[PDB]
Design a protein around this ligand. Sequence first.
Ligand SMILES: [Cl-]
Ligand SMILES: [Cl-]
Ligand SMILES: [Cl-]
Ligand SMILES: [Cl-]
Ligand SMILES: [Cl-]
Ligand SMILES: [Cl-]
Ligand SMILES: [Fe+3]
Ligand SMILES: [Fe+3]
Ligand SMILES: [Fe+3]
Ligand SMILES: [Fe+3]
Lengths: 381, 381
Amino acid sequence: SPIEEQATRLLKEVPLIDGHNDFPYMIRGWFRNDINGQDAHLYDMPIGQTDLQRLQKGLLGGQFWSAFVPCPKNPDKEVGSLEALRQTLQQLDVIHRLIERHPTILQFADSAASIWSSFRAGRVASLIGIEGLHQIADSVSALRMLHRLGVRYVTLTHNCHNAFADAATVSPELHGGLSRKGERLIRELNRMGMMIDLSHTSHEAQTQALRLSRAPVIYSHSSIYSLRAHARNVTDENLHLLHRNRGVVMICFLRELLASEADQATLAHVIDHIIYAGTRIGYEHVGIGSDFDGMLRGPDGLHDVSCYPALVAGLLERGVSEEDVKRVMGLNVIRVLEEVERVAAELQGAGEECLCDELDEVWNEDIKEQLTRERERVRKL
Amino acid sequence: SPIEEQATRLLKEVPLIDGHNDFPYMIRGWFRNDINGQDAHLYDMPIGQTDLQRLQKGLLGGQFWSAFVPCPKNPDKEVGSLEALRQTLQQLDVIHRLIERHPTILQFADSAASIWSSFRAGRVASLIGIEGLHQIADSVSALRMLHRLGVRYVTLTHNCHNAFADAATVSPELHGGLSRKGERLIRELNRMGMMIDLSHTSHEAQTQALRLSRAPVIYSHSSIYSLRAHARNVTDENLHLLHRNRGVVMICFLRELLASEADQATLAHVIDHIIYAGTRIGYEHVGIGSDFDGMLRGPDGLHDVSCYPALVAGLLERGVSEEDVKRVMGLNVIRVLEEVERVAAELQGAGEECLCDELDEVWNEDIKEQLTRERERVRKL
Ligand SMILES: [Cl-]
Ligand SMILES: [Cl-]
Ligand SMILES: [Cl-]
Ligand SMILES: [Cl-]
Ligand SMILES: [Cl-]
Ligand SMILES: [Cl-]
Ligand SMILES: [Fe+3]
Ligand SMILES: [Fe+3]
Ligand SMILES: [Fe+3]
Ligand SMILES: [Fe+3]
């Protein structure tokens, strides 16, 4: 077929970079992060929508691998919050081990340059995102260390409110958008060069973040409110503010976000959503954000990671131009990552002060007096 | 003076790499890790034995900066252990920020090559070590992520027993050396390329670690038992096993480890200890491990980080050869780091299986059946 030949050509010309995949959490569920001697299963999985053979088959150029851990359910809030941090390091660890044990398929990337070098080598550019600020355990220091471990976006919430922002699915509202700490964290996220992800956050939290952010943001996996009314989808208001922000909405394959009855959801519905956003706010602000392995069953025609060529062909069939399809595939999310890094370099170049954690005093006045008294003795020498 | 000219020449020919300095914890004590607008104080500190002016003055070539946090004192052991992990990320964060805000003085290093490139650029090679396995919160995944954050040695204990090994100062003994988990962790530390540090560990724990380790280890800050009997000092037995191990004992400036009465401790005592070890197990297995800022007051002549030229001159004055002084200064610890990395590359090249954490089951049998049933449906398509 000519359109399938066209789709295959585009997939090798530019990387299709998917916004969100929970394959690392499936490894935690199935293997408990022990992948020693499990290559046969990692290439051909007995569960889930992602494995290394199907990943190759669908010609995916890059992937933001989710380092998601669940919202804390311990009655002791201190324990649950700290437990989420330990579990986050476990998920970051298995992601890095997955990449390092399969270097012919996966190659770690944390920038636009590293995405392209991975793609030109014939690897899936493997980036990392955390899904919720519950994962940092109220520690901006921890957040900066997650950036050093390779995390390049942070979803501000999952399906629970935190100290910084409100989730979409939980009611009633806690902060009514972003908190004071949330507003201050946006500045720090822009300063460090962490991409803001507005998926799972409330409509009001999106509006406030889109106005405040000095860098372009993403929706790593969200769809369109006007076509399908859901708390998780993006309103026309926030789509316009995303345009002003220079951000990208990466369209989700979640069946509940595409149709009123989930079993009616299709590949066509995903294309409807991409075209709606592309028509109204331009094709340079739309992406692909599957959320594969964040669901049991995908839409008809998008059942697993092998189905991306059908999506690329489907967009071309509906009259989306070759250049605009390349933008939707991956050039847009590359641009946002570029601009996030460029804004960070500008703010770090100017010497902007970083956000610090509020710590307890470890020394009393007696210890501090002994230290100053000791320093003065050394000055006399 | 000719000897002072000789000492100054050696300090610029090869890097003096100190094994242990707790300046990051002094920053936590004094500034609470908020160093924004504090350069005047960071160059000329009102407390402690380390600042950036005195660091330059003493001509130090490199430093393993300690990311120490105290042993957990919470009655809830789960909370205290997890709290130590969060505090570790805070200390790693302030170390990286200290280095990045002062790039003319400090340059991050995590290898022998990066030590030399830092030294040839005129910077203090800034490496990182954690002080106690309580800091990883019983998570080998976290430990690997600490390695990714730049940690290149792990002291197996501080002044508390943990799941892996016994501390020296605490009685009674818990494991009687290393535990089963401790023995297994030694293999993982060798595999990942993490340098083992035997300071603060019990005599029996040292003996077992020195026999088991496939890579050379260090004592980042310990002195000699035969000259001064203390639980923290190294016995003649363990000195010989260190020789077989190919490791390095980095001699400590702690006054309690050098003399029976602390106020009697001197620069001469430190030199006595270096010469004792150098005479008996060779000068290629001895280093310098100040423990500056792990004490209030240092020995007479070694009061702060500006005093290293007096130590180099003191060693030359006592008849230690120019080549042997260069070894003690830093070439030995560089060699150990080289060999630790070489052993890691060999074991990782062979494809040795990594140690994994024991995780809870997140899915029940019903969820696993739904997933396998879903996968089979996709296979039929
Ligand atoms: Cl290019
Ligand atoms: Cl930073
Ligand atoms: Cl704290
Ligand atoms: Cl050299
Ligand atoms: Cl590894
Ligand atoms: Cl767990
Ligand atoms: Fe997810
Ligand atoms: Fe999600
Ligand atoms: Fe220390
Ligand atoms: Fe110590």
